[PDB]
């Protein structure tokens, strides 16, 4: 189809010109001659019949003059029931060494995003039992969340955990997209979730699907991984009238990636370093992961912010498309605090009184409030010392200490790394602690007694144990 | 055989740029059709080729594509059909509810009004929020930015403006009455459908117009509906009528314009942005203006909203927009978290228009206000530990402290310029000072309603006279004076 | 009289520690804009080089 | 004359191609062909017989291929004493609506700074009538005056003021360049202007001309608008041999739009993103602001500090030209001292013996002191008591809290609102009174006798009224 050759090969840009007719952009041109399969997607139309592409994977071996083919579709991967419990690649793959993946259905991983009228208006919460969420920042069925942290913060982890306590229990199927993260997590989930249960090798009840561009894929596979796996879950959604859930690890690597070949593609750099088309990339990624009047997709989304920095562009575009944000401080990991969940920047959308009900409302409030308050006395603490406040100033550290506490919650999949056993606290429970520490019921109890438990009822227990021990 | 006067042939399409041949009498910003149907903008009539940036994805553009010539510069439909209506950047529904009856396109590149032809803003444009009408005044035809950092209030602050618009619109009086246009620049659809089915829920769509350009759209479309939204709005203030309009995320279009200049390969400036973009701003908001009398006397005010990162208000769009803009209205997530909501910094907070956008009652107690709160900041500092001072700054921070708990008012509550005079009046005469500070939002509350059902007749006087006359701060001294008495319960 | 003592000598304290405060504000106000300012300069730089790369 | 055509219409920089000889640079070239007039100032010969050019006006609607011709010299502007009362845009097109401006003659607005021997060699004080300037910061004449403050310090009030002392007692008029002047703004300004009566309608009494350069336009006009209003000041001093007041606006504006216009002509920016050419534009601008053998521009420039950094290059670079500062506080217009001039904060160069008089320099710095001392102890009154000071403490404080107010003078242009006729309050009358309390001689005085009051004599005056 219109056989093109290889001009020109500088790192993942590939120029081929085609004698006949021209293949149009993000259409998939297959290099042909190489012992792999090496995709080839169209970016731009240079001209005198020629197109810059962008390799989905090594560009050595490549030799000028190689006749490159055209499909004629953007990249097309299997989709369907069969594919979960497996792994495949940016070009759909199988790369769990279990055969190939017959899915009666292929489909494009780019496509249009759905329109204005196929937007759900409704906003339910979804309890994932943390403290820290389920209270200050709930997470919402179908909304957008997404995991903003730096690196070593908690936001693996913490997917991990969102992961085992909702997508276990969630009936309706997932879809894991790693890009461009770590491929020993991504061997460590797949290993963990045969042993879950949720990968079945043996019968057909798998419930989530993998699809992993690691770090060591070229910057071109790490910038459209995130679309296969969001194509995916569409299918999830569209095809089949179900509620899907999209993980994905890192899209900060999205934006990178494109970071990466936009020179080469010949863009003048945008600020800081980014590519010009930074927002627009991203919003056509993002848009097309929303939950329409069809089907429900409720996406939890790891973002890296770069040196920590939540001004740096790509975490700063990323916040305007999800609903639910949760932040992860390193200072409070610094602390211990685990989950690192920041208590005064952690928003949600939900986070309404109408929605969520007055007492949850205004004992969130009534704990960020505190906490701020706790901020301003340090300040003082600083200078004055403690033994130099007010009682009442006392009393407010004192309690915020406590709140801070009491927001760490052990997590089952941090069970090898903290030692202590995962608990799952109920939202009530949850509510009705934090009141009742707001309240000054349990002020007695020493703040060592709130720190690694569950509810309030653990947090009392363990201080008659230290007292026991004393 | 090709004219190439008329009609072009794409030489190159990429990024949203497409190098097209031909064209030769094309006229700079005239809107020309692709091949595929996709339209698109010529702004580099370079000379050689004439660089047409995509208003679509450019999948369907390829190279040798006839791009023809439509002859006319960007129009959107104008008119008050629109009323009612989600549209997009180019006015094309989007709410799936039919055509758009409009009967006159207007260009989005018209030039602002002169000199001449504007007026002082005195017409005071109530936001309905207690510490913006009080301490932040804004008069129809100023623009006053709504700027702060995420997750702020700065959408609520614009929204709520909206709600309270429904009051006087309702009503038969004309010269009050303000239809709102909202520009959503970068929102996501989900987020512009939340929004409007919160205005639809107010029931105030019927007085809104939602342009929205969302992320998915493409960057031209994005640069586009400030302009578009303003021209729709300008069709009110040219025929007597009062408009407002909230470009929301203005820096998003800032974004999209970058984008296009940089692909466009426009020199590059500071962070990336192109020179122009003061110029792209400016000559948006300068439309925002009060006619006098001879071209009708209508307005269109400006609401821009920017997100400053950090509270970097030195950073290049913001500095653009506040230079461009009559004041702002600083937002701090601090004040956010510590029960200050709304999270209007009164500090940083200015109006250039001033009091002149204030009604004469809302002058005589928010001059009080303004300063005895601006004596409390002054002492806010000893609060902490300022039990032993003098009893002058244990005054001060008491009389601080109850506004503060009087300025705090509800999200999705916008309140009438009477309410808001008396709860002013009951703070700044000193009625909350022996109140627990606690107490006060709940007296707030429970005085409003007893205000508003039991002395209907007074607020009447308020909102018809628009003075607190000698007899009305009689009458409103005894109302709440016996009301403070029984209150506490 | 230790206790009149005591607070004048914590008032003149603090007093001093305000100004030594100040003195390392303007100084660190110093490096912050010229800091700020080779930020921007670097940040223009950086744009500028990969302008005429290509 | 050597009619063009549009070769490349890229933003406000579009490119003209000149068949026949190559216009200079510096040079308008009107396009053919629009209802509304765009000139185009000629910046770079590109060779191949083009000109890259930069538009005053949108550029929308140019078509390539459109033709443009030249006028053969740098933008000219009406120029005479008509323009007084007018408000004429960077064109010099009326933009008043009160028909066209008919002057006898019309100058470029590029013109070069005057020559080494035209300079004077002495520097003079241009004598305000105020007296907070002209005692602590005196004005100089020729020089460059830095107008800190911004609104609710009395900035039109002050400048209108001028205008109307300058007016009054030089005999020369003013010209008002305001650079990317708020319209809406601009509008205020002129109304007040014509209440106050600097600007009169009905006839030529008229003592101020308006060059606005309103954001909505492009940023080569906002940068020549200042160059425009320079020019119209330039008639009064070498053909009238006048002393001209040029009130420019926000120069930080002026800066920025040359910043502009560097970018969109591609010029790699300089540090901090500003122009490459920061320094000679702005030399080329100030140093036409001068004191020639005819008469003098003195110039009330309003300076933006961008986040508040005086070592930004815009600060720096405006600051090497200034000659004065004027800073507006809030605070003392808390005070109520009107016009709300910091003294202690407001300096001048020309604050030297050998140009203002051995007793100048005396009152000024004594002044300076008996203000710096009150402040100084004003703390010590605050912890300790009013009782708790020396006697010459109190002293200090009751001749300081009387310079303080006497500092305060009605002005002229607000006497309708104020109902207290505006004085114009001789160097000599200013160092005469403040000398006086200095000496102690009316300590005996109330000090709301020496509030908005003009000469010494009317404190006295009024403190015999009182009571
Ligand atoms: N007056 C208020 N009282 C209580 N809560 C408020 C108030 N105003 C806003 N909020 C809360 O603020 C949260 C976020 O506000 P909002 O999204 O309007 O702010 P923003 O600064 O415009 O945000 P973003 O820039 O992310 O869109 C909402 O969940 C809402 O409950
Ligand atoms: N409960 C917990 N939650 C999160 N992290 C924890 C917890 N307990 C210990 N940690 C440590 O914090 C680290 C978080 O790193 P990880 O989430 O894997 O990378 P990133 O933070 O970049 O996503 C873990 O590797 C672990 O060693
Ligand atoms: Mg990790
Ligand atoms: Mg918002």
């Given at each position: ?114 329109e204005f009228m196929?937007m ?351 | ?38 339209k ?15 208003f ?18 960007v129009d959107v439909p104008v008119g008050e059909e629109l009323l009612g209506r989600v549209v997009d950047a180019l006015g094309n529904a989007i709410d799936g509810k039919?055509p758009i009856?409009s009967?006159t396109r207007r260009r989005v590149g018209l ?44 959408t609520?602050?614009a929204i709520?403006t909206i ?16 239809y709102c246009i909202y520009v959503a620049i970068g929102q996501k659809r989900?987020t512009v459908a939340q929004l409007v089915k919160r205005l639809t829920?107010?029931?105030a769509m019927k007085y809104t117009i939602v342009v929205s350009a969302t992320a998915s759209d493409a960057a031209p479309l994005q640069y586009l509906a400030p302009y578009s939204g303003c021209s729709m709005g300008e069709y009110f203030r ?5 408009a407002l309009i909230i470009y929301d995320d203005l820096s998003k279009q800032?974004?999209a314009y ?26 948006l908001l300068?439309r925002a ?11 269109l005010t400006a609401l821009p909203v ?184 | ?54």
């Amino acid at each position: 189809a219109a056989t093109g050759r290889i001009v020109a090969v500088i790192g993942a840009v590939v120029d081929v010109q085609f004698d006949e007719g021209l293949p149009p952009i993000l259409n998939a041109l297959e290099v042909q001659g190489r012992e792999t399969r090496l995709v080839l997607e169209v970016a731009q139309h240079l001209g005198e019949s020629t197109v810059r592409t962008i390799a989905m994977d090594g560009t050595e071996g490549l030799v000028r003059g190689q006749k490159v083919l055209d499909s004629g579709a953007p990249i097309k991967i299997p989709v369907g029931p069969e594919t979960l419990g497996r792994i495949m690649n940016v070009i759909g793959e199988p790369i769990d060494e279990r055969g190939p993946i017959k899915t009666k259905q292929f489909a494009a991983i780019h496509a249009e995003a759905p329109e204005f009228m196929e937007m759900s208006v409704e906003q339910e919460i979804l309890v994932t039992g943390i403290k820290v969420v389920d209270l200050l920042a709930p997470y919402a069925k179908g909304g957008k969340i997404g995991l903003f942290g730096g690196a070593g913060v908690g936001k693996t982890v913490l997917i991990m955990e969102l992961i085992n306590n909702v997508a276990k229990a969630h009936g309706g199927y997932s879809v894991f997209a790693g890009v461009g993260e770590r491929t020993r997590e991504g061997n460590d989930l797949y290993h963990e979730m045969i042993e879950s249960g949720v990968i079945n090798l043996k019968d057909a009840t798998s419930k989530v699907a993998l699809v992993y561009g690691q770090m060591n894929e070229p910057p071109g596979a790490r910038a459209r991984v995130a679309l296969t796996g969001l194509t995916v879950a569409e299918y999830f959604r569209d095809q089949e009238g179900q509620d899907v859930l999209l993980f994905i690890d890192n899209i900060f690597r999205f934006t990178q990636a494109g970071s990466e070949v936009s020179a080469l593609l010949g863009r003048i750099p945008s600020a800081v370093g980014y590519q010009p088309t930074l927002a627009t990339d991203m919003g056509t990624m993002q848009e097309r992961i929303t939950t329409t009047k069809k089907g429900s997709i409720t996406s939890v989304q790891a973002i890296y912010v770069p040196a920590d920095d939540l001004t740096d562009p790509a975490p700063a575009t990323t916040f305007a498309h999800l609903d639910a944000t949760t932040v992860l401080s390193r200072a409070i990991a610094e602390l211990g605090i685990y989950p690192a969940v920041d208590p005064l920047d952690s928003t949600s959308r939900i986070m309404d009184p109408n929605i969520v009900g007055s007492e949850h409302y205004d004992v969130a409030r009534g704990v960020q409030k505190i906490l701020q308050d706790y901020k301003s006395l340090q300040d003082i603490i600083a200078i004055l010392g403690m033994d130099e406040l007010s009682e009442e100033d006392k009393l407010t550290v004192s309690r915020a200490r406590k709140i801070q506490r009491f927001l760490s919650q052990p997590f089952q999949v941090a069970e090898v790394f903290t030692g202590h056993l995962g608990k799952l606290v109920p939202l009530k429970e949850t509510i009705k602690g934090f009141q009742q520490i707001l309240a000054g019921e349990y002020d007695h109890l020493p703040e060592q007694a709130f720190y690694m438990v569950g509810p309030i009822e653990e947090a009392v227990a363990k201080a008659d144990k230290l007292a026991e021990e004393h | 055989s090709v004219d190439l006067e008329e009609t072009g042939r794409v030489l190159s399409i990429g990024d949203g740029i497409a190098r097209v041949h031909g064209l030769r009498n094309v006229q700079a910003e005239e809107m020309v059709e692709f091949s595929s149907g996709l339209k698109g903008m010529s702004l580099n009539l370079e000379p050689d080729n004439v660089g047409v940036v995509v208003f679509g994805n450019d999948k369907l553009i390829k190279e040798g594509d006839i791009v023809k010539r439509t002859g006319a510069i960007v129009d959107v439909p104008v008119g008050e059909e629109l009323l009612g209506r989600v549209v997009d950047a180019l006015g094309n529904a989007i709410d799936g509810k039919g055509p758009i009856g409009s009967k006159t396109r207007r260009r989005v590149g018209l030039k602002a009004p002169g000199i001449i032809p504007r007026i002082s803003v005195r017409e005071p444009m109530q936001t309905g929020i207690k510490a913006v009408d009080s301490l932040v005044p804004i008069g129809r035809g100023q623009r006053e930015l709504i700027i702060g950092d995420r997750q702020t209030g700065k959408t609520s602050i614009a929204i709520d403006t909206i709600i309270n618009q429904k009051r006087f619109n309702d009503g038969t009086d004309e010269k009050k009455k303000l239809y709102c246009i909202y520009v959503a620049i970068g929102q996501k659809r989900s987020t512009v459908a939340q929004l409007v089915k919160r205005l639809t829920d107010a029931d105030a769509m019927k007085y809104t117009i939602v342009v929205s350009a969302t992320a998915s759209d493409a960057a031209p479309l994005q640069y586009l509906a400030p302009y578009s939204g303003c021209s729709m709005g300008e069709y009110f203030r040219d025929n007597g009528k009062h408009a407002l309009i909230i470009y929301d995320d203005l820096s998003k279009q800032a974004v999209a314009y970058r984008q296009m200049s940089l692909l466009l390969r426009r020199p590059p400036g500071r962070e990336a942005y192109p020179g122009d973009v003061f110029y792209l701003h400016s000559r948006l908001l300068e439309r925002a203006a009060k006619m006098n009398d001879a071209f009708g006397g209508g307005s269109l005010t400006a609401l821009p909203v920017i997100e400053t990162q950090a509270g970097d208000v030195s950073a290049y769009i913001p500095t653009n927009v506040i230079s461009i803009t009559d004041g702002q209205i600083f937002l701090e997530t601090e004040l956010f978290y510590k029960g200050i909501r709304p999270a209007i910094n009164v500090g940083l907070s200015v109006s250039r228009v001033g009091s002149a956008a204030q009604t004469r009652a809302m002058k005589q107690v928010a001059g009080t206000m303004k300063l005895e709160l601006a004596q409390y900041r002054e002492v806010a500092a000893f609060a902490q530990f300022g039990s032993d001072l003098d009893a002058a700054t244990q005054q001060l921070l008491s009389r601080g402290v109850r506004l503060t708990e009087l300025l705090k008012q509800g999200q999705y509550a916008p309140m009438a310029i009477e309410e808001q005079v008396a709860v002013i009046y009951a703070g700044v005469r000193g009625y909350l000072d022996k109140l627990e500070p606690s107490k006060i939002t709940k007296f707030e509350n429970a005085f409003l309603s007893h205000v508003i059902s039991q002395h209907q007749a007074l607020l009447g006087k308020i909102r018809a006279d628009g003075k607190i006359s000698e007899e009305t701060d009689a009458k409103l001294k005894e109302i709440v004076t016996n009301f403070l008495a029984g209150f506490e319960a | 009289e230790s206790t009149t003592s005591e607070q004048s000598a914590r008032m003149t304290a603090m007093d001093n520690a305000s100004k030594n405060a100040s003195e390392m504000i303007d100084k660190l106000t110093l490096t912050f804009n010229r800091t700020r300012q080779a930020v921007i300069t670097k940040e223009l730089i950086e744009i500028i080089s990969g302008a005429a790369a290509l």
